[PDB]
Amino acid sequence: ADVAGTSNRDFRGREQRLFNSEQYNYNNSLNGEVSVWVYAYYSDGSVLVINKNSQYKVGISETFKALKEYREGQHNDSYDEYEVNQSIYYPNGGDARKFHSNAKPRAIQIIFSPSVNVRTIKMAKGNAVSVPDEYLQRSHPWEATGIKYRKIKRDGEIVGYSHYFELPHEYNSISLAVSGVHKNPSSYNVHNVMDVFQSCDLALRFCNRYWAELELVNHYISPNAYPYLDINNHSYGVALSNRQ
Amino acid sequence: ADVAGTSNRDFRGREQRLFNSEQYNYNNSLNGEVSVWVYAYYSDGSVLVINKNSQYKVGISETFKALKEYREGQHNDSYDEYEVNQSIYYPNGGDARKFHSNAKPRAIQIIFSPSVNVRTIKMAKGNAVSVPDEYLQRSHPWEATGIKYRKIKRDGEIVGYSHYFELPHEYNSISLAVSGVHKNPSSYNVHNVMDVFQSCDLALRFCNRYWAELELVNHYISPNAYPYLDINNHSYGVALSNRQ
Amino acid sequence: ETFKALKEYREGQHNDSYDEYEVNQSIYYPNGGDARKFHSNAKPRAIQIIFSPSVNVRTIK
Amino acid sequence: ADVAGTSNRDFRGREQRLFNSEQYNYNNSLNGEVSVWVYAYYSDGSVLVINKNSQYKVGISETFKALKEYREGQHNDSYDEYEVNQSIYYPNGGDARKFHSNAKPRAIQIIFSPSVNVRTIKMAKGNAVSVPDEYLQRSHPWEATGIKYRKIKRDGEIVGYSHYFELPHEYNSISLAVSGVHKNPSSYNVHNVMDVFQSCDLALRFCNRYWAELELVNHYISPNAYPYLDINNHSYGVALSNRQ
Ligand SMILES: [Cl-]
Numbered sequence: 046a047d048v049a050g051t052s053n054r055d056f057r058g059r060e061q062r063l064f065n066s067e068q069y070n071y072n073n074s075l076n077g078e079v080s081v082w083v084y085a086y087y088s089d090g091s092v093l094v095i096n097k098n099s100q101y102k103v104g105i106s107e108t109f110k111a112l113k114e115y116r117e118g119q120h121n122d123s124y125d126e127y128e129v130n131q132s133i134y135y136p137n138g139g140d141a142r143k144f145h146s147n148a149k150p151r152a153i154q155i156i157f158s159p160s161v162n163v164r165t166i167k168m169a170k171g172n173a174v175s176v177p178d179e180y181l182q183r184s185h186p187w188e189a190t191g192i193k194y195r196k197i198k199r200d201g202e203i204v205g206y207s208h209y210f211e212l213p214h215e216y217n218s219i220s221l222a223v224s225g226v227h228k229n230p231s232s233y234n235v236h237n238v239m240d241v242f243q244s245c246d247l248a249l250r251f252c253n254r255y256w257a258e259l260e261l262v263n264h265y266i267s268p269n270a271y272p273y274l275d276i277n278n279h280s281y282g283v284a285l286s287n288r289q
Numbered sequence: 290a291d292v293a294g295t296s297n298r299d300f301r302g303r304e305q306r307l308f309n310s311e312q313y314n315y316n317n318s319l320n321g322e323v324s325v326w327v328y329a330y331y332s333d334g335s336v337l338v339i340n341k342n343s344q345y346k347v348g349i350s351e352t353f354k355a356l357k358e359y360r361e362g363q364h365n366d367s368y369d370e371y372e373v374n375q376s377i378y379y380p381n382g383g384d385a386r387k388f389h390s391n392a393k394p395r396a397i398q399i400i401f402s403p404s405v406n407v408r409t410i411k412m413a414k415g416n417a418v419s420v421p422d423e424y425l426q427r428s429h430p431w432e433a434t435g436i437k438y439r440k441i442k443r444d445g446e447i448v449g450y451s452h453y454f455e456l457p458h459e460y461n462s463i464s465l466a467v468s469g470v471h472k473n474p475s476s477y478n479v480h481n482v483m484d485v486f487q488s489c490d491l492a493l494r495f496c497n498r499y500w501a502e503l504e505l506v507n508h509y510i511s512p513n514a515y516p517y518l519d520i521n522n523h524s525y526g527v528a529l530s531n532r533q
Numbered sequence: 534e535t536f537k538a539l540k541e542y543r544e545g546q547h548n549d550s551y552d553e554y555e556v557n558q559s560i561y562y563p564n565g566g567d568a569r570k571f572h573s574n575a576k577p578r579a580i581q582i583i584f585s586p587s588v589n590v591r592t593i594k
Numbered sequence: 595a596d597v598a599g600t601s602n603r604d605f606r607g608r609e610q611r612l613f614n615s616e617q618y619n620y621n622n623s624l625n626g627e628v629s630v631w632v633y634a635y636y637s638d639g640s641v642l643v644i645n646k647n648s649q650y651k652v653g654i655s656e657t658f659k660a661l662k663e664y665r666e667g668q669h670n671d672s673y674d675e676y677e678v679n680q681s682i683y684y685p686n687g688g689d690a691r692k693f694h695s696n697a698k699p700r701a702i703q704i705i706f707s708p709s710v711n712v713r714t715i716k717m718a719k720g721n722a723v724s725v726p727d728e729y730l731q732r733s734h735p736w737e738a739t740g741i742k743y744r745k746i747k748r749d750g751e752i753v754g755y756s757h758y759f760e761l762p763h764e765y766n767s768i769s770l771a772v773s774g775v776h777k778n779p780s781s782y783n784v785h786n787v788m789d790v791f792q793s794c795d796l797a798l799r800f801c802n803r804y805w806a807e808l809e810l811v812n813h814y815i816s817p818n819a820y821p822y823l824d825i826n827n828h829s830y831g832v833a834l835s836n837r838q
């Protein structure tokens with residue numbers, strides 16, 4: 046046979062490049078996944094991740110309370126935190142023994158897979174009682190925030206999209222939903238509506254609290270080939286198109 | 290300038306009336322919210338509220354167990370209440386140390402925003418094992434209960450719609466889903482189906498147990514300009530159309 | 534005051550006492566403890582020192 | 595340039611030797627620290643360290659009770675240990691459920707920095723009620739124990755001073771204070787008295803219970819360049835004077 050890395054008959058090298066290309070492109074086909082992650086960052090350094098992975102479209106919707114830190118199998122000041130919630134829902138509505146709950150998120154990062162169409166992204170960032178914009182009567186139920194998403198890039202390739210917002214002020218108390226649609230550069234969609242209804246049931250969800258962004262990078266992002274952007278603006282992910 | 294409240298050049302007064310009219314009408318546009326609330330009333334006077342707010346259509350679906358009272362950070366007779374559930378699911382199925390759980394709802398109020406089309410409202414009031422009508426094989430999956438909804442009215446304007454039913458008997462043990470569609474007096478809808486799928490992800494949810502109907506009125510209904518009907522048949526809400 | 538003495542202590546409430554001993558070991562020497570958190574919320578975020586107007590500022594140490 | 599390690603123009607080597615010499619000498623200047631450590635060794639192998647670091651003079655003073663083992667966040671037989679204290683303060687004074695408390699120190703090591711003047715060291719080793727010598731009326735308030743301190747040595751240099759005494763008998767129940775003065779080979783001291791008063795406030799204290807002498811060596815002594823002498827008579831510390 047020819048010697049490796051010297052001719053157009055390195056079929057191991059061609060197949061390696063095809064295998065990676067086929068992953069990148071399959072994910073972009075309508076048979077592929079589109080995925081979203083919400084990361085909620087807490088003052089103790091831990092991070093709640095919620096991920097949804099589904100065909101055609103995907104999203105996540107959480108209450109104010111659901112986004113608060115919950116430490117499984119440890120103390121959570123449960124009763125005092127019920128009272129903190131009452132005061133967050135309406136000023137002076139509760140009788141808590143603290144000014145600021147450390148279970149409140151300090152920041153949110155939303156990441157989508159590179160199979161999303163950025164122009165389809167919509168976010169409903171509500172107040173603590175799940176109202177998008179002060180009162181329901183004046184609320185558009187979403188804002189299309191695609192323009193704000195940064196490309197997460199590795200080796201020149203877009204591996205995902207990131208929108209990051211801090212919640213550093215006492216009044217930053219939110220409920221949150223986000224949604225994106227998988228790329229569809231075709232004009233195909235009539236005939237497939239029941240399949241999209243089935244995708245609503247088929248969407249897989251994951252949620253977990255990791256103890257540190259390091260741990261998120263090491264045990265969540267990296268093992269799964271997920272895109273990420275860390276606090277130091279470092280991009281993670283795996284470039285696949287036309288690559289060995 | 291002209292003197293306030295004496296001429297057609299009171300533009301502060303015209304803009305105030307327009308601002309309120311525009312809220313009422315925006316909520317009725319297809320760009321607006323439609324919202325639903327389920328209130329479950331407990332014997333200790335507390336009230337669980339579940340609210341969903343979304344574009345195009347909205348609903349809530351809860352199990353028998355999910356509607357039972359849960360007091361965050363306090364004792365809930367957790368083990369005995371598992372046994373009460375077994376006896377509610379099948380006669381004599383559990384080994385509880387009580388005849389009637391005080392965590393069972395005594396009543397349900399369903400309220401919709403005035404942007405719902407009443408004729409689209411559907412309810413699945415199931416038995417304790419989540420069957421609409423005795424056995425699945427004979428169950429229509431919903432009843433269209435719009436005719437029973439009362440108008441909640443302030444200053445002559447419909448501010449919401451209410452259906453209220455007590456559960457005062459021992460055998461009143463229910464699961465519950467409800468759904469309504471936003472007003473659509475146009476013939477527009479083709480082209481918008483993926484947007485409605487995104488609205489399923491974008492819908493915001495809120496749930497909380499308030500200690501008293503007084504507290505619900507003061508800290509939930511009123512601060513948010515929500516419609517309500519209290520036990521004394523008093524209507525709450527804010528009239529907006531053509532009003533200062 | 535010591536490092537430990539300046540950490541938050543909530544009288545009559547839970548203070549993650551055991552985990553906070555382990556956090557202290559890791560603060561004293563990298564990787565010295567086996568805590569279940571990255572950042573203790575009992576650590577001060579800031580210090581203000583105030584003196585009365587009867588101090589001589591040039592003597593402050 | 596000249597080649598490393600072959601001429602009097604290795605200025606990197608001269609500066610390295612100066613940097614170390616300047617540390618050794620600065621510590622001996624009156625601008626330097628003098629430091630003391632009390633190690634209390636427990637039967638479970640753990641060791642309480644108390645350290646004080648201050649200018650001009652330094653010391654530590656602890657009660658009998660303060661020197662007993664305290665395991666943070668674990669059980670400490672608190673009530674029984676109050677009763678053990680009553681019996682230690684006066685024979686048969688308490689009603690404990692044990693003959694010997696394992697929280698009692700088995701030994702004490704006192705170490706001073708090499709900037710102390712050994713002839714200034716004073717110790718008040720009291721009985722369990724904090725009396726130096728049986729009764730206050732006959733007590734000199736200290737003994738000058740410098741003659742008993744061994745030099746801790748590395749590479750020929752004194753890196754600290756150690757006095758070690760076991761408390762292996764049931765009646766070895768002590769309170770303890772120790773004090774040393776920083777070297778002052780000059781005749782300077784008038785003018786500086788308020789500065790010494792400020793040094794009483796400025797002295798920094800550290801205390802911690804380590805689980806093993808190994809851990810003390812690895813995570814306390816060594817990382818901080820502190821002198822130590824272990825149970826096997828091994829000296830630890832860093833020689834600095836005229837050394838690279
Ligand atoms: Cl395709």
Ligand SMILES: [Cl-]
Pocket residue numbers: 318319320
């Ligand atoms: Cl419209």
Ligand SMILES: [Cl-]
Pocket residue numbers: 623624625
């Ligand atoms: Cl000097």
